[PDB]
Amino acid sequence: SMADSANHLPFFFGNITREEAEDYLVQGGMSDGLYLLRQSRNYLGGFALSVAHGRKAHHYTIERELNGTYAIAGGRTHASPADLCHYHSQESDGLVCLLKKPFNRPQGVQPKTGPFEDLKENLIREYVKQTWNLQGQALEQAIISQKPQLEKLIATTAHEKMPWFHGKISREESEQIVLIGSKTNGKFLIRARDNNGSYALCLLHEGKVLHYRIDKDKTGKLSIPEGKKFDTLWQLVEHYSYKADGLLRVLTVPCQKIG
Ligand SMILES: [Cl-]
């Protein structure tokens, strides 16, 4: 992925929160035009630019366009995040200010990965072995050969393996499974609501199972009603585990699947 390329940038921090990005900018002196790069948490293949100006943090999403280039909303396209940052060191072109000085990862600090990122490589290896039945040669060549296609596919299906995803079960069945055992606030699962890629969130709140529709928009972006848009369910779950953002509370412990 571009994220693997972006690891060679000393000011790329991987998947950190907005708040963690801001903490790093303070560490680096919060000087005008101080910036770092990180991974977009809701745009698949996306990045985010965090910049200090007037002792405030300014955050910009860098989207991966359909042709595979990189752009901030209403901006020009670039071959890479590195090229976008270089361009913005010479032209503000819509940003609050010039990108003056990168804030590098302090020593000890690597780019941060989420749960998806930590199982992505294993799932790609497994899919090649057990759908193209290689055990050597292409086993490794086929992975690198077809990395972009495999990353995109594994991104769209990696939820199916995750402990909070309970598959094609009804509202009534989901309520039954959440209500069994410990009544921990935020206990949750996601279920498939049809075959057209609609989903639902089931969330325990003061002993009541709340149900939230997760709908697919024109682009195939997922959201709860009036909520932030995500490319994948694993992005949505990471977000609402961090910030309630219109849910009555944050997601906590994944509901156990029938063993
Ligand atoms: Cl965030």
Task: Describe the model.
The protein has helices at residues 2-6, 18-27, 81-88, 115-129, 138-145, 147-157, 171-179, 233-242; strands spanning 34-39, 47-53, 56-64, 70-71, 101-102, 188-192, 199-205, 208-216, 222-223. With 259 residues, it is an alpha+beta fold. The strands form two sheets. Strands 4-3-2-1-5 form a five-stranded mixed beta sheet, sandwiched between helices. Strands 6-7-8-9 form a four-stranded antiparallel beta sheet. Strand 6 (188-192) and strand 7 form a beta hairpin. It binds chloride ion. Chloride ion is lined by residues 17-18, 41. One of its GO terms (biological process) is interleukin-3-mediated signaling pathway. The modification Phosphotyrosine is found at residues 24, 43, 127. GO terms for molecular function: ATP binding; integrin binding; interleukin-15 receptor binding; kinase activity; non-membrane spanning protein tyrosine kinase activity; phosphatase binding; phospholipase binding; phosphotyrosine residue binding.
Task: List the topology elements.
Elements: H1 2-6, H2 18-27, E1 34-39, E2 47-53, E3 56-64, E4 70-71, H3 81-88, E5 101-102, H4 115-129, H5 138-145, H6 147-157, H7 171-179, E6 188-192, E7 199-205, E8 208-216, E9 222-223, H8 233-242
Parallel strand pairs: 1-5
Antiparallel strand pairs: 1-2, 2-3, 3-4, 6-7, 7-8, 8-9
Bound molecules: chloride ion.
Note the main attributes of this structure:
8 helices, 29% helix, binds chloride ion, 9 strands, 3 domains, globular, 19% strand, 5-stranded mixed β-sheet, 4-stranded antiparallel β-sheet, SHC Adaptor Protein, alpha+beta, 259 residues
